[PDB]
Amino acid sequence: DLTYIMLGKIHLLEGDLDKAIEVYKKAVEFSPENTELLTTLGLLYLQLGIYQKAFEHLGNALTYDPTNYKAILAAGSMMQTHGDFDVALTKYRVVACAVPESPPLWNNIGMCFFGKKKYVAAISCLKRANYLAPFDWKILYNLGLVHLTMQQYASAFHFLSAAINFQPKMGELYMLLAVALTNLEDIENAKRAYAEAVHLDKCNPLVNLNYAVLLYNQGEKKNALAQYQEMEKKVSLLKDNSSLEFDSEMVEMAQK
Amino acid sequence: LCGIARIYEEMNNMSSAAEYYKEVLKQDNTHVEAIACIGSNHFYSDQPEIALRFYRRLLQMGIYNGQLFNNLGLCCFYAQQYDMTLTSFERALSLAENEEEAADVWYNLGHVAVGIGDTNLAHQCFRLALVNNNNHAEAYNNLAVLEMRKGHVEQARALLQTASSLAPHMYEPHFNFATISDKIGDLQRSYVAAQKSEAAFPDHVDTQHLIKQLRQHFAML
Amino acid sequence: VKSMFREVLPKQGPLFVEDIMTMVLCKPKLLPLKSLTLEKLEKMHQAAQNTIRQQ
């Protein structure tokens, strides 16, 4: 068994996971009772995009051992991607008396309260993570996102711009930071910050082109429908473009 | 009532200490040394807004130190009040008594600079805390996490090597040695490193996920 | 027709999927406030150097 995961260490380090799964698919075959081989297989299915098999393998690890901390957060993340927020905290409360200070744990419980609209609870819970781990990719982007929902626009510039410095190549941080600017008055910076936003992605997201029409709504008329028809077709995504389509109904209303 | 809550902080009995300091504030609402020791025990454990209220009031008595404009600078940042957060530091850099004292105000300014994300700014905040005062053990560790973010491994592993020898307590260089010296592979020094990160602070989580990570390697394959 | 003001936020975040062993920093410290005996005894001792600087 120990010869397997060092071989599994190779294909993740050099590159893709697709050949690395078959190393673990041999590994689960020889020992279907070990929880450590199952849990690493569960995260590997989830990075591929789940085909519901990852939900099965974690439960095998959970019944064979119910207190493994790495197993809980995966199923803690797995339930939380759909709903079941009240179910998610019941899983999380098992481990919170064992790892009382974990910043990946305290980010998730902060994000779980964001589903149940306990808005003032989440900032009091997320900021226990940002004290404990001062620079992260994910804690800072979560902490800035709850402020724009709470319309506390001046504080949200501080956290959103604090995560650009730690990983510059993101698209959606540049998308939200521009919305943090238009509630302030830096419209000169707003067109500049949006200019780096539309360039850094080039294939995946469609929300920021719906942001292109709102900046273009003020004092501009030509390239509105050019931005609106830009990448209108989605290749393969389950994101909520329908709530944007209500806003895009107002976008096509400007040009009709 | 101040003498009884002072021996409880010696044993760290803050479950029964900070109730008595709520009595020396019940009557005698201007005792100075029981205003900070509540307004500090709220800044930790995530009440950074209530802890500010105990420090703006202590300003209005009119004491005007340099140490207070440090503490007033830290509470406004963590409570997200961005106006008084930094003018209070420039007044704290000035009117500082000793040259060893202006180090600590540069050092707390570094934790501000990590909060905005600027590391180039943050790299020269701990440095100026270090040139204004050597043997500042909390900055040697803190400077060489910023080094390991860049890649200077052998530079970082000597600053933690001398942060530990200045503070033979305070678990944070000892545990941080055993995640540099574990990724390389030296599992003998990375044991005695993570040995002292248990004796100087037990009930740590990520030490107990590291000694049992090492003691599986020591028995057999 | 007053304004659209529709800036739809994603309503989702980057959940963690595992813990990572990382390096953590020293935490920021609040400086103590010296007592009125320590303020007096330092002021007396600071003047004790200047009277021996001339003698």
Binding site: - | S40, F43, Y44, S45, E138, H169, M170, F201 | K27, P32
Partner: peptide, 15 residues
Amino acid sequence: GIAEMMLDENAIAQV
């Protein structure tokens, strides 16, 4: 305001 033993900090130890 911030001490437990030989001038150690807090909020990463406890309380």
